[PDB]
Design a protein around this motif. Structure first.
Motif, short mmCIF file in Angstrom:
data_model
loop_
_atom_site.label_atom_id
_atom_site.label_comp_id
_atom_site.label_asym_id
_atom_site.label_seq_id
_atom_site.Cartn_x
_atom_site.Cartn_y
_atom_site.Cartn_z
N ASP A 164 0.82 -1.22 0.00
CA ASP A 164 0.00 0.00 0.00
C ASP A 164 0.86 1.28 0.00
O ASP A 164 2.08 1.22 0.28
CB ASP A 164 -0.91 0.00 1.23
CG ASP A 164 -0.10 -0.08 2.53
OD1 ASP A 164 0.04 0.96 3.21
OD2 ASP A 164 0.45 -1.17 2.85
N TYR A 165 0.24 2.42 -0.31
CA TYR A 165 1.00 3.71 -0.38
C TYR A 165 1.66 4.14 0.95
O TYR A 165 2.84 4.53 0.94
CB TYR A 165 0.19 4.88 -0.97
CG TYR A 165 1.06 6.13 -1.15
CD1 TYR A 165 2.02 6.19 -2.16
CD2 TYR A 165 0.97 7.20 -0.25
CE1 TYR A 165 2.84 7.29 -2.30
CE2 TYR A 165 1.78 8.33 -0.39
CZ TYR A 165 2.73 8.35 -1.41
OH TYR A 165 3.55 9.43 -1.57
N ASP A 192 -0.61 -1.25 -4.58
CA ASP A 192 -1.72 -2.21 -4.53
C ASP A 192 -1.83 -2.95 -5.86
O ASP A 192 -2.96 -3.13 -6.37
CB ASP A 192 -3.08 -1.48 -4.23
CG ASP A 192 -3.01 -0.53 -3.02
OD1 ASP A 192 -2.58 -0.96 -1.93
OD2 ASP A 192 -3.43 0.65 -3.15
N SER A 250 -3.13 3.24 -8.01
CA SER A 250 -3.40 2.06 -7.21
C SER A 250 -4.19 1.07 -8.08
O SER A 250 -5.14 1.46 -8.74
CB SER A 250 -4.20 2.44 -5.97
OG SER A 250 -4.68 1.29 -5.31
#
Ligand SMILES: Nc1ncnc2c1ncn2[C@@H]1O[C@H](COP(=O)(O)OP(=O)(O)OP(=O)(O)O)[C@@H](O)[C@H]1O
Ligand SMILES: Nc1ncnc2c1ncn2[C@@H]1O[C@H](COP(=O)(O)OP(=O)(O)OP(=O)(O)O)[C@@H](O)[C@H]1O
Ligand SMILES: [Mg+2]
Ligand SMILES: [Mg+2]
Ligand SMILES: [Mg+2]
Lengths: 462, 462
Positions: free
Chosen positions: A250-251, A287, A326
């Motif tokens: 994830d970011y 993601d 994402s």
């Protein structure tokens, strides 16, 4: 001296970019890029990366030990017995790429054809003749994915050991009765298959709902290899082409890790202004959900980089400066960077999810990072005598094989057992165009370099 | 001189079983067994066969021409234009293992990675730059089985040529308008995909509802290679182990063909009493439905050998003398012969249905028969100079490649285009433990022979 000590030792060294120093350095196996198929670097227009175990190489055995400890603590909390708390991670047991047989509770090391090289039940290594009861042809059908699970990544090392610990514990604890397919505890029956699922679910939980990421990020020096040469290599790549990141993470986590990897009091070279990690990339995508990413993928989303949340809805706009994506698909990258598959070198550590799938689904060029090579090479040279003897050479053959194998650990080399290559070795040779202990080894070659492998001939053609 | 002329020429020769004559004979490439992985013949306990294109090798180009003629006649009868009747089979066009792209109507020769080696639309060979319009990465996804069809067997040679003939015909006939994905005929649209399906259905029909079998059986000397050494080799196999037949063909056809193959005025050797073909087999199984046979298979049936009909119901009895099976699975064979996979050498001509699937599903030992090798070897030696020049060596590279390739036919060698190996070559190397122009080449080796291949090393291990 773990493979990560070796990587961090090389990481500590400044880059001498004098052309002769570079040529000398890359002669050493440790700093070399190995070639399965010829690849002309001048044709590479986009360099693609993943983060976990490629850009961010987690230190061993500290990170495996942490994963192991948190996975045990999760199992105990859902109701596994307290004796689990007395387990301690042992790095000398697991080798990567083993197959857990969920029917009989065995860890297997197999070749490309499903032939048994090593079989362990708990910590009991089962010899040739005894394996025939459960494996009559000394063979597994690996299309039987519901029965057999392949432990491909360095993230799977803690569970590789934990599976063996659990089978050992239940077998030897008189509260439980051993059956062919699991353990009886009075009116409760726990199959190896359901035990395996509990372990898999707990490992997933630790990473995604648990405290593993938080404990990593709070001591990055303990947990993550850091190298001043990373910014230098990336800046050089960006001079000749485009650079992208495609990560399954994830970011918010990616931001924490990547900030750390680039936290030096300078930019690409000492004396230069520091720049943010994001400036090194033409495209950033988190993601990714690889390998689904290389097929239909998922809906393309935009990250709000202030909050770390996804914006609501599908992103329909163009590539803009500072945008972070994402989900999406490999086609997103190709379209946005104006690239065809063969223009792309994708650098990955996941033999299946990064390398095999990008090669077979999209015809991408591939570079596999194998962090254990950093220490497997030392053993390969330092025990060359044992292998040489095996090549020369039946019960002496089995004995030499064992002694060779034991130098690597209880489950042997990642790449072989004696003269028999593993499944992992064959997939490396088949799907990874290039491979190395670290992607940093590319620093030591000029960007028009032609990596060469000999043409292959059939037996009737030789 | 077709590959079947070569096979029939060798077939005409009596067997000199003097041990020195045998050793001398097998030095010649034509009579040699080639080795991909080491195989100790003394460990083989069961020799398994298929019939079509293995025991019964159909003569070329006569049998392909017959299949072609009957397939055309079936298409015309269902409503294809009369101009089809002016087509004539041309053996210099098709090479085996091509991929028909049902979207764009192309025949492709590809490597193991889906890279384009040759692309033809009808009889127009499309050069590198022009292929990029339809194939932007010069690459096909071969997991896209609905789009791409691989023409694996010698039964597919007539349709390989017929597909190219049809695309050429519709493209150049002013009654039709060419589109990207097929042909417009007024208010009728025929996609390449639907045309392909018609061809496939017609080829299936000719074999299963049409007159192909009847016309073959009425002139077996014209259509089928016959060899006095067949009974000799089988009798020798039965002295050291068990022998079985597993064929996709039906009993009545198998009986006609096999009777012909064994119709000599003697048994295994001249001077010996003739025996029925069935006596050479410990187990006979027809309607095998390979490759499904190597998974769940189908219900085990018993053939009534008087009528040629199946008896009603599932067969639940034991292996008896004179029993003939229909359907079942590879497990039927293993159970009835008391064999494990590695005790079995299965001799097949279908790279996918016989060899790849028995290897990957069951861990059987494999022997691939490649009838074209009988003539591809002559070309390989007779033009060794061109290949040697290519190895030494850009527009000269493309030119030499073309001239090398043209020696084999319009679609090149089964095994390569210049220095690039085909998909077929790679599957041979990967899945066939042994291979040869003919299984009869086994006659020339003693039954304790150790076929040897060199151990494989990774680049970092070399
Ligand atoms: N390393 C891996 N990890 C997880 N899955 C894998 C891995 N390698 C292959 N698979 C997948 O496992 C399934 C069954 O494997 P299988 O042996 O039938 O195919 P394979 O990879 O094509 O074998 P081969 O190596 O002989 O080409 C397939 O869907 C395959 O894509
Ligand atoms: N020669 C063949 N003929 C028909 N089908 C095939 C053949 N070879 C492979 N297949 C099947 O086609 C499907 C798609 O092929 P794909 O490239 O994904 O797998 P593959 O055979 O494992 O590739 P690889 O040669 O790299 O191992 C798979 O189900 C595969 O079993
Ligand atoms: Mg990774
Ligand atoms: Mg056949
Ligand atoms: Mg495969």
């Amino acid at each position: 001296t773990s493979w990560s000590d070796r990587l961090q030792n090389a990481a500590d060294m400044p880059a001498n970019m004098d052309k002769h120093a570079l040529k000398k350095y890359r002669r050493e196996a440790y700093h070399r890029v190995f070639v399965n198929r010829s690849l002309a670097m001048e044709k590479i227009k986009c360099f693609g990366f993943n983060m976990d175990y490629t850009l961010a190489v987690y230190k061993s055995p500290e990170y495996e030990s942490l994963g192991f400890e948190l996975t045990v603590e999760r199992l105990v909390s859902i109701g596994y017995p307290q004796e689990l708390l007395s387990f301690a991670y042992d790095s000398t047991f697991p080798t990567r790429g083993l197959v857990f047989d969920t029917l009989y509770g065995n860890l297997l090391k197999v070749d490309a054809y499903g032939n048994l090289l090593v079989c362990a039940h708990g910590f009991n290594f089962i010899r040739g003749p005894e394996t025939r009861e459960q494996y009559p042809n000394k063979f597994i059908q690996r299309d039987d994915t519901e029965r057999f699970y392949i432990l491909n990544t360095l993230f799977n090392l803690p569970e590789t050991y934990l599976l063996a610990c659990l089978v050992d514990f239940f077998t030897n604890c008189p509260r439980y009765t051993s059956c062919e397919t699991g353990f009886k505890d009075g009116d409760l029956f726990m199959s190896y298959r359901s035990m395996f699922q509990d372990v898999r679910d707990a490992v997933d939980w630790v990473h995604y709902k648990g405290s593993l990421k938080e404990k990593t990020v709070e001591n990055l020096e303990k947990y993550v290899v850091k190298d001043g040469k990373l910014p230098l290599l990336l800046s050089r790549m960006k001079e000749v082409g485009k650079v992208f990141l495609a990560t399954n993470s994830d970011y918010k986590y990616t931001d924490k890790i990547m900030t750390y990897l680039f936290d030096f009091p300078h930019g690409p070279k000492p004396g230069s202004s520091h720049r943010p990690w994001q400036s090194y990339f033409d495209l950033i995508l988190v993601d990714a959900r690889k390998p689904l990413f290389f097929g239909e993928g998922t809906v393309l989303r935009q990250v709000d980089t202030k909050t770390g949340k996804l914006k609501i809805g599908t992103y329909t706009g163009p590539l803009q400066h500072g945008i972070v994506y994402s989900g999406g698909s490999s086609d997103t990258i190709c379209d946005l960077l104006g690239a065809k598959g063969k223009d792309i070198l994708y650098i990955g550590d996941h033999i299946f999810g990064d390398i095999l799938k990008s090669k077979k689904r999209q015809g991408w060029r591939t570079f596999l990072v194998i962090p254990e090579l950093a220490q497997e090479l030392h053993v390969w040279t330092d025990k060359s005598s044992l292998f040489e003897e095996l090549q020369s050479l039946q019960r002496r053959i089995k004995k030499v094989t064992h002694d060779m194998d034991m130098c690597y650990g209880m489950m042997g080399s990642l790449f072989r057992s004696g003269s028999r290559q593993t499944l992992f070795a064959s997939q490396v040779m088949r799907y990874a165009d290039l491979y190395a202990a670290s992607f940093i080894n590319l620093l030591y070659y000029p960007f028009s370099y032609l990596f060469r492998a000999a043409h292959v001939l059939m037996p009737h053609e030789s």
